[PDB]
Amino acid sequence: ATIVALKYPGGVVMAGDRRSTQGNMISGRDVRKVYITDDYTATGIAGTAAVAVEFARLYAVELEHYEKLEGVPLTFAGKINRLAIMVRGNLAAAMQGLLALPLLAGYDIHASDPQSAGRIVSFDAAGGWNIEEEGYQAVGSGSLFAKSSMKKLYSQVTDGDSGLRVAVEALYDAADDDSATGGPDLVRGIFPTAVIIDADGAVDVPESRIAELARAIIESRSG
Amino acid sequence: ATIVALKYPGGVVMAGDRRSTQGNMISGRDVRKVYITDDYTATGIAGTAAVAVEFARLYAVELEHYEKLEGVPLTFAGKINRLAIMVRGNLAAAMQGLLALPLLAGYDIHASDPQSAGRIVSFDAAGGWNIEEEGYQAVGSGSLFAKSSMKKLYSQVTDGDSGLRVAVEALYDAADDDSATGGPDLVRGIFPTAVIIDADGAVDVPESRIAELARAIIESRS
Amino acid sequence: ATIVALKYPGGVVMAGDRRSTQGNMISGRDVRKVYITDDYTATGIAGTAAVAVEFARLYAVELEHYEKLEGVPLTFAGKINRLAIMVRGNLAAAMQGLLALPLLAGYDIHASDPQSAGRIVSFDAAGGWNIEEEGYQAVGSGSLFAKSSMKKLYSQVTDGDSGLRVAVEALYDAADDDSATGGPDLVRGIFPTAVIIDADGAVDVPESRIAELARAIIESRS
Amino acid sequence: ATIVALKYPGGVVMAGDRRSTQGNMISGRDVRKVYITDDYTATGIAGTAAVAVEFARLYAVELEHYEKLEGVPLTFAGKINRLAIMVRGNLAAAMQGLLALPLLAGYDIHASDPQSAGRIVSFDAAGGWNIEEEGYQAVGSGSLFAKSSMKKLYSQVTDGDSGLRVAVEALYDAADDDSATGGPDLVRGIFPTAVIIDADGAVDVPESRIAELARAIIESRSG
Amino acid sequence: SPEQAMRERSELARKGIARAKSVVALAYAGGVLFVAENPSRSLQKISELYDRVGFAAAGKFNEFDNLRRGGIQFADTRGYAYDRRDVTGRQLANVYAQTLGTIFTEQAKPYEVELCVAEVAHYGETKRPELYRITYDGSIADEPHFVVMGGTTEPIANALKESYAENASLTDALRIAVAALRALGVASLEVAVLDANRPRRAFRRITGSALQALL
Amino acid sequence: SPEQAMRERSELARKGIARAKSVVALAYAGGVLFVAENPSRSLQKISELYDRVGFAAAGKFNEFDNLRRGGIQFADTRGYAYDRRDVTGRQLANVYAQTLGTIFTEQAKPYEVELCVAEVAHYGETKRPELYRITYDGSIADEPHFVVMGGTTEPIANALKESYAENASLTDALRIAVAALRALGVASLEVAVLDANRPRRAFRRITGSALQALL
Amino acid sequence: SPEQAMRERSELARKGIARAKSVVALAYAGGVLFVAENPSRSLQKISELYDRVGFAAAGKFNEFDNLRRGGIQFADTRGYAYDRRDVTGRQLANVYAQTLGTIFTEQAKPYEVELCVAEVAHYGETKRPELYRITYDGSIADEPHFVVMGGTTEPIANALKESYAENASLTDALRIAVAALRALGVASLEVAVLDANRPRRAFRRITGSALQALL
Amino acid sequence: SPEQAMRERSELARKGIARAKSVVALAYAGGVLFVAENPSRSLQKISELYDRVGFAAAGKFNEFDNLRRGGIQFADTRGYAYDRRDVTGRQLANVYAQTLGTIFTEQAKPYEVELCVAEVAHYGETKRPELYRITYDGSIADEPHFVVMGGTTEPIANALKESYAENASLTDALRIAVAALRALGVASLEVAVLDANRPRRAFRRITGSALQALL
Amino acid sequence: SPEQAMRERSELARKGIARAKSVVALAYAGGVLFVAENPSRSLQKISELYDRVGFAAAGKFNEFDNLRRGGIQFADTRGYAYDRRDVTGRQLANVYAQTLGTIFTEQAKPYEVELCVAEVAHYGETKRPELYRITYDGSIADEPHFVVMGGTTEPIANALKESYAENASLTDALRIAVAALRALGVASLEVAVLDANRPRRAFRRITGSALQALL
Amino acid sequence: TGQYL
Amino acid sequence: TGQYL
Amino acid sequence: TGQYL
């Protein structure tokens, strides 16, 4: 598994691969690992599949529940805290092999400068969290290859689309150097999933866009 | 054990073998592993026999209980969720050897396109589930051989009958390459069990039809 | 220990040996392992002697208690279920060496055909149960030898008496090939115990008949 | 990690590095480990990142809570006690490898002599505490190198500024001899963080001053 | 005074039972037929209890729905604890009687409800339909042919007394039941059956266009 | 005496319900429209309950907000326990009815509240908006077109009776609702919709300048 | 009788509220100003609640200090559970309203108290000060300019009505507030501010010689 | 009636307080002086509470000794939980006020007690002695010079008003206190001091021959 | 009315105390002497409480034996928790006072009992015997010479007033006590001593022939 | 009361 | 009472 | 009442 997230001028983008394994055996070719937890935050979860889907679902429920009781969403700080408390809660099961690490991307509407209101937050197994400031993050078995790819490719990010292409490429390299991460399957037509968040909220990138970017990358490397 | 399930144009079919072992010893020659939990879902369970029959029974009770209280069946999503919560509940006992994995086949009446309202859902020991998209699934010790058989035979599936034959064949190959899975016993007359779900509900395939298909396969391979 | 049960046209018969050991040492020469739990069932229990006698006693109490409260005995299905739950409850103690496995014979008064209303049901340590379809069952250290004997002898079973003789013989072979199972003691005059259930209920076979059959077998083999 | 604290004539200063690691891997380049828990104290925490940030947060909450209920802050003694009780409370998790050790700097307004009202307090894993009297303390993997540096450099401390300079230098030597402690990053412009407490409360040293001090030290070492 | 409290509670309840719509349940060839006068589309007065046991009620909706839920709870706990074929309409009726008696003597207000528990035989089996009526106090009565609950029961009970015919088909029993109930279209009728021919779950609602054809 | 306590509780509640501002809810082309007369900027009488289920109330604020909170609690616990599409406006209405009946008979003072639960269809789906009114005693009524709660309901209900038009746009239904409510500016109106066109969360407030343009 | 108990409790409380000193809270350029007539040096009627939320009360000291403590408890538990910037003056006011309503209906004696919750914007932020008044029954009112609590409120409220000026400095607002309160030296005044310019904790008492200079 | 129960409880308590011996506490150069009229040798009405906080009482012995014990409990739990120098006479006085109010409103009989909590500064420190009087209802008063409790307080209070002198030595303050108390030998006096000069524990009894020399 | 219940409880108890046999306790050279008029041989009114602390009572046997047991419980739990020489007659007397006050105010019927707790010095130690009398309300009195409990106390108290002599031997004090008690043989007297000369356990009964010789 | 069916 | 909306 | 047998 591998989930990358990067800020661009005016927003944030978050993409994830599609493979799910059991040991050396490829078990799922189309898992969706990036959810839209709310109108301004998306959540990716690496790790155990059950714990992952569960985290995502419950967190979405909690955000929206407080929103309905109080009539206003939590601040981005409160959201960070609640997610952190969930993660800290799964610590015993994580030491028993049910580890799930979330990467949280959000667009802060209350931030002063809109061009830098994007937000990326990463968590460890013990519930601590960091607000990334080097402009990108990733989680999962291919995270190191993805980060080492974005470190070089990130000067090209100038808007929403360039940032999306860089995301897809980072995933391609993760998969290229790690077998637990699936690459674009040209035969079956299965591509990474992507979510874009900006001033207007969160929308899913329609699969076609991710397809054309993937085929541009592949064609670029074949030459 | 081995239980296959495959969608066909307009429905779903689910079949299971009949053997139950204790080590190398063959202890049961006619166990039924595929139940009709409700008018639109059948459930197969592989693994520890006790935990299996319990899961099946209790799940059927729960579906029907909510149906009587609220006056309407759960959506297919709700059913998936309840089954997953049961499976997650058995996790400690599964780590202590009492593992049971269910494979759930259903026909969604609320789906938009009737021709693709078939549904297959697979579970792991940790309660996570996955909606199958490649058109077939299997569970049990023979599952890998059964899936590798259906991958090749699946282009032949065009209706309820052809889908049934492909099911029986997949079982035959599971049994052919694994000793814990029983094949058709021509001497005693015991054949796999099958359930067919379509727009009109779930019905058990009568034994004679499965017998005929099994004989067709066996003559085909001699 | 070894307890066999077999269905004959019109009824069921259940017989058990008499030895109880501690390691290699013969500690009991006349234990009774087959009880009449109610007018239409009989329960044999192999395993730890304490847990066995306790199971039998408590189960009989529970069947009869529900009968007095509700004014009607449970169906054979309900009885099967309660016995299964009692067995599942002893699983923790069974893993600690206090295992007890029951074999339940009954005559279903509500069945459709009287000639096949006989019922045999076997249990494992994990509470799962199974309704036998091959006409016989056995439990205990000699069960494999007893079953392999009845497989061959069972075509001779045509009534209550021939079924009784086949039972006694199966026991004789269990004891013949396993030292933990006692055979007929001609010196002290101790023979297997037997219970017969048919349309009229359950009765203990009086010792003389079992003595006869044992002497016929022993003469045949010399 | 390494956090130094030293008294000077009239106040106290407390500085901390910025690196956070996982094994040999540098994971955070700008963590802030020194907090202002209240107008007259500052708390550094070495150790596990989660336990650390949470300690700091919850302790600040408790100090301020009693202050709102009773209308007067606790004495420096009471504060010491509460922090000690928290630390003692984490002892089981610390034996499970979740250890977090705090170093507490404060300015006692009730002390008799203002010139020596500065206070430094150190804790072990079992909640025992000790009021330092030799004028300086440190905590973390670089603490021994930092203390052995301040022992020699401390005769130069005569006011708030010289004390700050000595703090930064001690950090530089910690980092110089230990790899888990980050030094001043001249490339990215990330410098230690510092808090100064005196008669007028606690203020964060603005980054520029720490920058100039670091560059003075670096020009001194290279000749 | 036990006498004044008994009599007064009795009057209170009987009033609120006559202060409601009317339900009938009658035996016909395929099992038992429930026909209730019910305007709402969400609130129902006829329900499945167990595989072959149905339930109708008349009175205060929140209370007989409380009883509906309790009965469902009971039946399922028994069926799982013992087996499905062990739960009988007779047990259910008895539990409702005990519970309505305890409510009638111990709670502040008596349940202004009237219950009818119905049972048919199992699939491929032969046995006459059983109807029981449980009243607010705990009394239980065994009915051979039909039960009428709620509102003014005399004219409906008499009209059924003249029109009833054993082994009437589904359509005739529906005509008789609607006629005697009048003494109403598909938009004001709640109709269901305990069809003895179904394999397991016998209860089956008859609504919309199928109901339109039947009546 | 059960009769005197019943009648007196009834009067107590009905008084405190007429002793409050007025709320209306009506069906229009895009779903359901809530228009309440509300001066405060913090205290609200219209709320999201679940994805497609909205809620309006009139009476004593602390109590119908207690019910608001309870309903939110219920709906979310169900949605998580089963699924989101299983929670329906009908279940919610029924729970409110049970709870208001229990409060009306068991607590010291009856809740001087009047509730309206609204539901629309899911996204890309087709189905008529459902309105339910739950009164202080536990009674529940199914409304086809509009609900009026609190204050003097007769003139508003009649004005709506003359002006109502099915499939009216958002602006027309707003004009009709404000007009019939008068029988008030953006500083004295609380307006929200259950927009059937939204993908998931249908509830959406209309405040400030957008509200200014609409009216 | 619910009416006689309601009216009588109302009178009881309103008496004990007029049977106490007077407090005023008004908006000025730097935030909000609390000025209370308080002789004791240990017992206080003005308090910090959270970073930007202050609190004043008038009545029975043990009870409004009970509320003071409860509110502190609440605010800190929320701030820790979610975050500091999530606790708002509005939530606090609402909790006090629910609690004073529950006390007013359920406890033996109603809390003879009158509360004012105040909030200002965060540092470097822009937003108008919000004042809420919560009365003994649970009622809550949104005040734009000033709140007067306890004693005879009419003359003070009118004097403030003539003297009030938005964006008055700290000294002018102090003169206006002491003047209208007279309708007293540093030894009989409790004065504090919610200074909007402070970075985090906005509440700040003005006592002794600094107070002497200001007035 | 809240008014009749309040007035009657007030009278009950005030009677039982005038129905007891008299205690005085006054400030002098070395701290605070307690002088009580006490015949018994085992039963005491003056007690250490914490390092610098003393306590005197007048009324019903079992009850003010109950309060004595509760206060000791409180002070030690705080001192251990935070630190010794954090417990102040002011907190203690406040707790006694809350507790006597709760007793006065909630228990069957009000505590016929009158309390005086005293505090002096720490060693080598400078600060004026503080005296608080807590009455049976919960009222608390800050006294600058002396407190008189129990019996007829007017003549003793006036005699002290004429004889009091700040910074009087221990012998002079003892003469003044015994004189004003008369308005008795070592066998009928309980005398203790809060000596501000002691390093930690300030409370110190003056009995026997030392008391004999002082008076 | 607190006054009528107080006075009535007082009369009830004082009656039941005068409605019983008489006990005396007096100091003599070797310690303290208890002499009670007791016909039964099993039921006793004099008891050891701790090493040097004795106990006599008069009233209702079941209740003062309840107190006897409670006191034994208390004394042993203290002695074990701290040490034997820490339990004193004064603590015990105080506990009985608190307990009889709580009983006298809180229980249905007041304990018609009168208690006397006695203490002597330890072995080889010098100190005067202490006698305390605890009455039914909780009052406790310090007696220098003798206590008389139960029945008509005036004539016995006066006869003792004329006959008492400090440092009287055991025989003389026995004659004085029996004589003043008459104002009875070994078959109607319960006699015990707190002999100060014993090493540890001071209580010692004097019965049978030894008692015969002493009197 | 109410809720009659 | 109060708090009517 | 009722349920007499």
Chain G partners within 8 Å of F12 (Cβ): 2
Best mutation target, F74, F78, F83, to test chain B (most B CBs within 10 A): F83
Sign of the alpha-carbon dihedral angle for F103, F104, F105, F107: positive
User: Rounded to whole angstroms, how far apart are CA atoms H138 and H143?
Assistant: 16
H105 neighbourhood in chain G, CB within 8 Å:
108-109
Residues of chain F with C-beta less than 8 angstroms from the C-beta of J3:
97, 101, 137-140
Cβ neighbours of residue C217 closer than 8 Å, sequence gap 6 or more: C165, C168, C169, C172
I11 interfaces chain H, CB cutoff of 8 Å = no
Options 3.60.21.10, 3.10.129.10, 2.60.40.60, 3.60.20.10; which CATH number does B1-222 get?
A: 3.60.20.10
CB of D72 within 8 Å of a chain G CB? The answer is no
- If contacts are CB pairs under 8 Å, which of residues 123-162 in chain B contact chain E? none
* Resolution, expressed in angstroms to one decimal: 3.5
Question: DSSP labels for chain D?
Answer: -EEEEEEETTEEEEEE---EEETTEEEESS---EEEEETTEEEEEEE-HHHHHHHHHHHHHHHHHHHHHHSSPPPHHHHHHHHHHHHHHTHHHHHTT--EEEEEEEE-TT-S-GGG-EEEEEE-TTS-EEE--SSEEEEETTHHHHHHHHHHHGGG--SHHHHHHHHHHHHHHHHHH-TTS---BTTTTB--EEEEEETTEEEEPPHHHHHHHHHHHHHHHT-
Tell me how far apart the alpha carbons of residues F30 and F169 are, in angstroms, rounded to a whole number.
7
Given CA atoms F32, F37, F40, F43 in this order, what sign does their dihedral have?
negative
Structure tokens at E147: 């039960």
Task: Give phi and psi for E89, each to the nearest 5.
Answer: -60, -30
Q: How many CB atoms lie within 10 A of CB F34?
A: 26
Q: On the CB side of D25, how many CA atoms lie within 13 Å of its CA?
A: 3
Q: Cα F108–F114–F119 angle (5° rounding)? A: 135
* Residue of C67, C72, C129 to mutate, testing the E interface (most E Cβ within 10 Å of its Cβ): C72
Q: Which contiguous run of DSSP H or E holds residue F23? A: strand F23-28
Task: Considering only the beta carbons, identify the residue of F12, F62, F109 that sits closest to G98.
Answer: F62
Residue G96 CB contacts under 8 Å (≥ 6 apart), including other chains: G67, G71, G115, G117, G134, G140
Nearest 5°: CA angle at I135, between I131 and I140?
50
Pairwise CA distance, residues D44 & D56, whole Å: 8
Residue type, position C14, single letter? M
Distances (CA, A) of C99 to C48, C82, C122, D132: 6, 18, 15, 66
Q: How many CA atoms lie within 13 A of E147 on its CB side?
A: 30
Q: Radius of gyration (Cα) for chain C, nearest Å?
A: 17
β-sheet with C136-139: strand ranges across: C136-139, C3-8, C11-16, C193-198, C201-204
- DSSP letter assigned to residue F142: E
Handedness of CA I5, I7, I11, I13 (dihedral sign): positive
Residue of B58, B64, B56, B36 lying closest to B205 (CA atoms): B36
Tokens 């008294």 — which residue?
D7
Report CB contact under 8 Å: G76, D71: no
Measured between beta carbons, which residues in chain D are less than 8 angstroms from residue G84? none
- Report residue C94 CA to chain centroid gap: 20
Give K-chain residues touching F58 at CB under 8 angstroms. Answer: 5
Q: Are F59 and F111 in contact (CB under 8 A)?
A: yes
User: What does the longest C-alpha to C-alpha distance in chain I come to?
Assistant: 56
Q: Quote the CA–CA distance of B122 and B101 in Å, as a whole number.
A: 8
Sheet holding G189-195, edge to edge: G146-149, G23-28, G31-37, G189-195, G203-205
Whether chain H has a CB inside 8 Å of the CB on G1: the answer is no
Is the CB of F41 inside 8 Å of chain G's CB atoms?
Answer: yes
Q: Do chains D and J touch (3 or more CB pairs under 8 A)?
A: no
**Secondary structure of chain H as H, E, C letters:** CHHHHHHHHHHHHHHHHHCCCCEEEEEECCEEEEEEECCCCCCCCEEEEECCEEEEEEECHHHHHHHHHHHHHHHHHHHHHCCHHHCCHHHHHHHHHHHHHHHHHHCCCCCCEEEEEEECCCCCCCCCCEEEEECCCCCEEEECCEEEECCCHHHHHHHHHHHCCCCCCHHHHHHHHHHHHHCCCCCCEEEEEEECCCCCCCEEECCHHHHHHHC
CA dihedral sign, ordered A176, A182, A184, A188: positive
- Residue linked to tokens 């077939």: B136
Inter-residue contact B40 to B202 (CB < 8 Å): yes
Distances (CA, A) of H185 to D196, G22, H152: 62, 50, 20
Cβ(G118)–Cβ(G196) below 8 Å: no
The verdict on H98 touching G (C-beta cutoff 8 Å) is yes
Cα gap H133→D7, rounded to integer Å: 45
In angstroms, the Cα distances linking G121 to G31, G94, G194, G199, G202 are 8, 19, 10, 11, 9
Report helix angle C76-89 to C49-70, nearest 10.
140
Cα separation of I131 and I127, whole Å?
13
- Distance from the Cα of residue G206 to its chain's centroid: 16
Residues in Cβ contact with H39 at an 8 Å cutoff, skipping those fewer than 6 apart:
H187, H188
Task: Output the six-digit token pair for G17.
Answer: 């509220």
**Smallest Cα–Cα separation from D136: which of D150, D148, D149?**
D150
**Cα G28 to Cα G194: distance, rounded to the nearest angstrom:** 10
CB of H155 within 8 Å of a chain G CB? The answer is: no
Of B29, B30, B49, nearest to C128 by CB-CB distance is B49
Cβ–Cβ under 8 Å, residues C204 and C193: yes
Under CATH, which number does the domain H1-215 receive? 3.60.20.10
Cα distance between residue A168 and residue B36, in whole Å: 45
Task: State the DSSP H helix or E strand holding residue C163, giving kind and residue range, or none if neither.
Answer: helix C160-177
How far off is chain G from K5, nearest CA to CA, in Å?
Answer: 10
Residue F166 φ/ψ, nearest 5 degrees: -70, 145
DSSP code, position C143: H
Are E68 and E52 contacting, i.e. CB atoms less than 8 angstroms apart? no
Backbone dihedral angles phi then psi of residue I59, each to the nearest 5 degrees: 155, -130
| Residue from I116, I111, I108, I118 nearest I136 by CA | I111
Residues C55 and C86 sit within 8 Å (Cβ to Cβ): yes
Among all residues of chain H, which has the CA nearest to that of G63? H98
I105 touching H (Cβ < 8 Å): yes
Give the Cβ contact number of residue E120 at 10 Å.
27
Beta-bridge partners for H132: H117, H142
Cβ <8 Å between E43 and F140: yes
Chain D residues bordering chain A (beta-carbon distance below 8 Å): 20, 27-31, 48-51, 53, 98
User: Whole-angstrom Cα distance, residue A148 to residue A130?
Assistant: 19
Residue bearing tokens 């009476």: F59
At I95, the amino acid letter reads V
What Å distances lie between residue C28 and A86, C25, C188, CA to CA? 61, 9, 13
In angstroms, the first-to-last Cα distance of chain I is 52
Nearest in space to C109 (alpha carbons), one of C84, C86, C79, C129: C79
Q: Cβ separation of G41 and H98 shorter than 8 Å?
A: no
CATH number among 3.10.20.600, 2.60.40.650, 3.60.20.10, 3.20.20.190, domain D1-223: 3.60.20.10
- The residue assigned the tokens 């006390």 is G103
Edge-to-edge strands, sheet with E53-59: E46-50, E53-59, E113-119, E130-134, E140-143
Which residues in E have their CB inside 8 Å of a CB on C? 81-83, 85-86, 91
CB contact under 8 Å between E43 and F98, yes or no, is no
Domain residue spans in chain D?
Answer: 1-223
Is residue H5 less than 8 Å (CB to CB) from chain I? no
CA distances from A57 to A17, A54, H184 (A): 19, 5, 82
Task: Tell whether the torsion through CA atoms of I148, I153, I154 and I160 is positive or negative.
Answer: negative
